[PDB]
Amino acid sequence: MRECISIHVGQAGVQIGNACWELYCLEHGIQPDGQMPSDKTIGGGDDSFNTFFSETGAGKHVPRAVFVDLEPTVIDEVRTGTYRQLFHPEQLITGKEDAANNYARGHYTIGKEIIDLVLDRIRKLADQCTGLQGFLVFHSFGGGTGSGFTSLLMERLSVDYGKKSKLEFSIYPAPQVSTAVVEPYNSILTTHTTLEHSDCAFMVDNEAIYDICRRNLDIERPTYTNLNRLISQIVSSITASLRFDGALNVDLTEFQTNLVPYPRIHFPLATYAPVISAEKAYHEQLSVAEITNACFEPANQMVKCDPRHGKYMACCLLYRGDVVPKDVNAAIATIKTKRSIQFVDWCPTGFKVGINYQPPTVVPGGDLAKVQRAVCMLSNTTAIAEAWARLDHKFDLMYAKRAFVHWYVGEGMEEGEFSEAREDMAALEKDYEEVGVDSV
């Protein structure tokens, strides 16, 4: 019951999916061939990890996941990688020609040729669910497939599944690892198109993750592998409530109730701690208070913005490991009297806390140290609008000259779609200003 289906779109979505599902298997003791010796119920069950894994008669635990890309090379690495036996071949869907960093090709020209097949495969997973709860869509903002095809899929999912929950993990572009000049275009187009079809979206700023790996892990030039290992830890913390059971465990939907005050205000800010190397973590145990305090250090956020210059509409703490409420309450009380935590006047100031007792896991050969306790903070702050503002400014500079627009018009799009998408972003920025204004 309460099954969740994960959809990984484009290179960024697929490769992040590799890190997440490898981490999930390590957390649940699932072998690369899908066997889970600790699972005594063969062929099925209603355990907490069954929300993300289905079970075959042969004892294989199969991810409730679909990998989609318009180009085969990235998913071909999954088909021949370490976890190739984990997925049925029909879960890995590939085309022959990608979207070439063009939203129009991903949404219309190339995406329309594979969209029906993807929905059919998604339907096959849904038919195996007795209590399907929603979808988790992993994609980049800047890629043609991650932007164009994701928005097309989200529109189709709303039609075929009504108002069933759809959550995003969205990769916000950064110049350090970006691959296209038109990424601000694809970002604005996909945000506008997906906005009414998404219930909750966790943005991951590649620059924030890039800086954390350099600063906290002493990685000179972080790779996608470095970034994805860190991203999967945040994703694991967010989904740990769905995959594990505990007395102090709080369901993600319960957090989602506090995080979304209006349908369009559904972009939580994520902060994760501790991110520390093995050398620095040796003989240095970080307490509940220390990791909680690091959640309010802006250098640890997954999106670059300054919450101290904005207002809070929700604050959630998702602990995992050796954590008890007594230490949480004392740590929160210390933070309340030492941090710039200003709430809007129409929202309660209490912090919502969840604890999963299962300790954090690390992929062998990685850079993250294995710690006894970790925390991910999910906050709804007006400061996340700064991420929209930076993206919208880049959009305006190019669109004032209509630079690169012919690549989109040539694939069938119109200039009206650009202005309509930009106006929606301008309204979205205005919405974040309005919710921060004090009541009269």
Binding site: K112, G162, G412, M413
Partner: protein
Amino acid sequence: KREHEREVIQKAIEENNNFIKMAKEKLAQKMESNKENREAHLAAMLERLQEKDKHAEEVRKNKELKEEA
């Protein structure tokens, strides 16, 4: 109160169906409009290339006329 309870759940059904209907119609309009626009751009490109072929035939025909004299 029972009548109000029926009206609330019917209202939720109607709004959910209307959202599905609007999403389906908006997408179909976009996909059809995009298909026409892309085909129009390709048709214009091919027409210009055909006009180049017509010009080339005119040029070659013009050479035969002067070669006779």
